[PDB]
Amino acid sequence: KQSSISVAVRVRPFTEAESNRLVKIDNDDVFLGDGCLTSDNNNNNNNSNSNGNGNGNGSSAANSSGASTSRRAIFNTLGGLRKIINVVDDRMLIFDPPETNPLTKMQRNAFPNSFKGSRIREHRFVFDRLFDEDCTQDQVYRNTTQPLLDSVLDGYNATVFAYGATGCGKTHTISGTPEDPGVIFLTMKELYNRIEELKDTKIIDISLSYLEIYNETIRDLLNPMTQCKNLVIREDANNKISVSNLSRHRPNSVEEVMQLILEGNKNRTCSPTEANATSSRSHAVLQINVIQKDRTGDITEEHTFATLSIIDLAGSERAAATKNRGARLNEGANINKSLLALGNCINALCDPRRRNHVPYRDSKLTRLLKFSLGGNCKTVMIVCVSPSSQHYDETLNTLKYADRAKEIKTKLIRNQHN
C-alpha cells in the first residue's frame, strides 16, 4: 500500500519580446551555422549580415563572445538560446546541451582552458512525465490530475502545488486568466459532471476554502474585513491544523462558485508597474472538501471523506532589477524565507537519518504543508521553469529542487470506516 510523490515539469513558451531576439540569432546558427557548418570553402564563418541587419556595413559594433559567433552589437544583453532546456521525449531530458556550439567542440582534448564546464554538467534527469512548449491546458490536465481526481472521489486525499521562479507562469498554469482557464476550472467542471453521472446512486457535497500567506500572516480572500491579527494557526491534540475563523463557504451551482473564485482572486496584491501585471506577490491555498453519502439504504455503506489542495507559490525574486528596494525587497524577502523553509523541509525529509526531526515548525507555509508532504495524501508537483539562457541559474536551482523530493514515502489507507 506504499505510494510515491510524482513530478511533472512545464516549459514556458517564448514571449514575444524575447521571441524576436530568438528569431534574430538562434535560427541561422542552428540550421546552417553551428548545427551543420560547411566545407573548407566557406568564405564567411559567422559575420554575415543576412540575418535581419544584425551588423552594420563595416566593422563589428561590439566585441564578440567567440569567433564572431554572437554579441554583434551593443544592446542590453545577448540573450540567445546558448544555454537552454531540451525536451527530446516524454520520459527524459538533458540540460546544458553538449556540442551546442563549435567552440565547445574545439574545447575538448585541447588545453584544459574553459574545460570541465559542460563535461561535469553531463547529467541526465529522469522524471515521470515531461511537457513541451506547445501544450495547452487540456493537455496538461489529461495526465496531471485525472488519475488524482479518480482517486479523490474514492476517498483518498490529494495535493498539487506550483513551483519555480518568477516569469514561468505559475498563476496562469494554476489560477488561469479571465479567458484562458486554469487547472481548478477544469477540475471543477469535471467534478460537477461526475456528480451528475453518479447522482441517484451516491450523493456528494463539496466545500470551498481559500487563504493567503501574505507577509507571513493569514488572510481569507473569500471574506475581507477579517484582520490578520485575529487569524492564527493553532492545533488539536490529534495532529490537525484547523485555522480559526475560516469563512468556509459552500457552493451550489457552477456559476456561483466560479464567480466567487473570481471575486476572491480580485483582491490579491500584485505588482502594477511592469508588463508582468500577473506577478503574484503572495502564496495561496485553495481547498476542496468532498463528502459522500450512500443511497442504497442497506449494508455496505461506504461513508467516505476526501479533500483536494491546490497551492500557488509566489516565486523567489533575486537582486536582478527589482528597484525601489526596501518595499519590494521586503515583500520579496518574506517569500524568500518561506521558500527557504520549504526547501530545508524537503532536504531534511528526503534523507534516511534526519527523518526523526523533519522540521515543519517553521515559517507559516512549511506548517500549512504539514499534511501535504509526509501525511496520507498523494501529491503531484507542477514546476514551471523558463528555458531561456537569460534565466539560467533560476532553471538550474529550480530543477535541482525538482530532482529532490522525488523519493518521498507516504502510507495511504483512505478515510473509509464502517
Binding site: P112, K116, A333, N336
Partner: protein, 440 residues
C-alpha cells in the same frame, strides 16, 4: 599624466589607508599641514610625485581619495585625527546604520542609500584627472561594508567609466583575530562577485602578517597598529613604482602584463624581507645576494602555503634604496641554481626585475629599522589554491546544516546564490589544479 585614484571601503580599508597616507605624506616631504619645501621653487606641474597629490591656489596638496565606511566612528576618528587639514572636508559621513557583519545587508538594503553620492564624489575627483589611469580599492573579504559595498561600487564605476584598470587590496581572514563566524560566507560571495571584474587582487593574509610580526618583530600580542604599519609597508613598496621616474623604474602597470595569464587566475603572493626590529638591527648590514635569497624562504610569505612542493608560474622582483646593477645579475644567477625552484612547463621567461632609487622610510616612533636594501616579490603559483581549499572546507562544514543562511536570505537574497558561488570557487580551484598539468 597617470593620476590613479585610491578608494578605501570599510574599517580595515580606512585604517590601512590612513597608515599609507601618513607614510606617503612623510616620504615626499609633505607636512601634515599641507605645504612642502620643494614647491617653494617648483610651485607645481606634472612631476613624478604629483601623480597622487594635486595642486591648489594656496599649494595645499590635497590627497586623491574618498573614505567610504558606513560606521561613522572610524571616519570621525580620522576627521578628529592628526590629518585634519590634509583631506578636504568631503569624507563620506554616514549618519545611518552599517552592514553589521552581513554581506547581504550592505549590498542590497543600505548600500543603495549612499551609492549615488559616492559616485558623485568619485566623479568629482576623476574629472580633475586629465589622464586617469586606474583605481586602487581597499577592502576585506570577511567584513561587512568591506565585503559588499566594494562589490557593488566596483560594478557601478566600471559600467560608468568603461574599461579602466582596477586594483584591489584584500585582507583574507584568520581565526586568531576573527570578529565573526560568517566570514567564510562573505568571502565566498564577494569572491564570486569580484572575480569577473577585478584585474588583479592581492592577498594580504592576516595570519601571516600576525605570525611574522610575532617571530621577526618580538612583540607577543601585537595590536592592530603593528599590523597596520607592516601592511602599509608592503603597500608602499608596491605603490612606489609610480611616484618616481628614475632609471630602471619599470612602471606598476607593466607588471600586470607578466602576472595574469587569464582573467580569473590573478591572485599572486607577496613577500618582503628587510623587516628587523629597531633595537636589534645594528651589528650587521645586509647584502643583495642574501636579501634576494631570503625572499624565497617559506617563512616570509604573506599567504600560508608551500611553493616548494607546487610550481612557479612567473616572478617579479622590485628593489628599493641603493642597489647597483652589477650585483643583481650575480644574485639572480646564484638563486637560479637552486633545484627546489621549478617553473611551469610553458614559460621559462625568468625573473623580471625593477629598481627604484629612493630609501624606504618609517614613521617616527615606529618599530621597523631603516634598512635601505628593501626587496619585494610578486609571483603567482599553484600553491595559493590550497588557501581557497581551506575556505571551501569550511563551506562543507557550515552548509550541510544550513547554519546562518536565514540572516542573508532575509535581506532580499535567494538561496540559489550560495551554491552558485560555491561552484564558482570550485571552478577556480580546478582551474588552478589543471594549469599545472604537463605539456605532453
Amino acid at each position: 599624466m597617470r593620476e590613479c585614484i585610491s578608494i578605501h571601503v570599510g574599517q580595515a580599508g580606512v585604517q590601512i589607508g590612513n597608515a599609507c597616507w601618513e607614510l606617503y605624506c612623510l616620504e615626499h616631504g609633505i607636512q601634515p599641514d599641507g605645504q612642502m619645501p620643494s614647491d617653494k621653487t617648483i610651485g607645481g606641474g606634472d612631476d613624478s610625485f604629483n601623480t597622487f597629490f594635486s595642486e591648489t591656489g594656496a599649494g595645499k596638496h590635497v590627497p586623491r581619495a574618498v573614505f567610504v565606511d558606513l560606521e561613522p566612528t572610524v571616519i570621525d576618528e580620522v576627521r578628529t585625527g592628526t590629518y585634519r587639514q590634509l583631506f578636504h572636508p568631503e569624507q563620506l559621513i554616514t549618519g545611518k546604520e552599517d552592514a553589521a557583519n552581513n554581506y547581504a545587508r550592505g549590498h542590497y538594503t543600505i548600500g543603495k542609500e549612499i551609492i549615488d553620492l559616492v559616485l558623485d564624489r568619485i566623479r568629482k575627483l576623476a574629472d580633475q584627472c586629465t589622464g586617469l589611469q586606474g583605481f586602487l580599492v581597499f577592502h576585506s573579504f570577511g567584513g561587512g561594508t568591506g565585503s559588499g559595498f566594494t562589490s557593488l561600487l566596483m560594478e557601478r564605476l566600471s559600467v560608468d567609466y568603461g574599461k579602466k584598470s582596477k586594483l584591489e587590496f584584500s585582507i583574507y581572514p584568520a581565526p586568531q583575530v576573527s570578529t565573526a563566524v560568517v566570514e567564510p560566507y562573505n568571502s565566498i560571495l564577494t569572491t564570486h562577485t569580484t572575480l569577473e571584474h577585478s584585474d588583479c587582487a592581492f592577498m594580504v593574509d592576516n595570519e601571516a602578517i600576525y605570525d611574522i610580526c610575532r617571530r621577526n618583530l618580538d612583540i607577543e600580542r601585537p595590536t592592530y597598529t603593528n599590523l597596520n604599519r607592516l601592511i602599509s609597508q608592503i603597500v608602499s613598496s608596491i605603490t612606489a613604482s609610480l611616484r618616481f621616474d628614475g632609471a630602471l623604474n619599470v612602471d606598476l602597470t607593466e607588471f600586470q602584463t607578466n602576472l595574469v595569464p587569464y582573467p580569473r587566475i590573478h591572485f599572486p603572493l607577496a613577500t618582503y624581507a628587510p623587516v628587523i626590529s629597531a633595537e636589534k638591527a645594528y651589528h650587521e648590514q645586509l647584502s643583495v645576494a642574501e636579501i634576494t635569497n631570503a625572499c624565497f624562504e617559506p617563512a616570509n610569505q604573506m599567504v600560508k602555503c608551500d611553493p616548494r612542493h607546487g610550481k612557479y608560474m612567473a616572478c617579479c622582483l622590485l628593489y628599493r634604496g641603493d642597489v647597483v646593477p652589477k650585483d643583481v645579475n650575480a644574485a639572480i644567477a646564484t638563486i637560479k641554481t637552486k633545484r627546489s625552484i621549478q617553473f611551469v612547463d610553458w614559460c621559462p621567461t625568468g625573473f623580471k626585475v625593477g629598481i627604484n632609487y629612493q630609501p624606504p622610510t618609517v614613521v617616527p616612533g615606529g618599530d621597523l629599522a631603516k634598512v635601505q636594501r628593501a626587496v619585494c616579490m610578486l609571483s603567482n603559483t599553484t600553491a595559493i589554491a590550497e588557501a581557497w581549499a581551506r575556505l571551501d572546507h569550511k563551506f562543507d562544514l557550515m552548509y550541510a546544516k544550513r547554519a546562518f543562511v536565514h540572516w542573508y536570505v532575509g535581506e532580499g537574497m535567494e538561496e540559489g546564490e550560495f551554491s552558485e558561488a560555491r561552484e564558482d570557487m570550485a571552478a577556480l580551484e580546478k582551474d588552478y589544479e589543471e594549469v599545472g598539468v604537463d605539456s605532453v
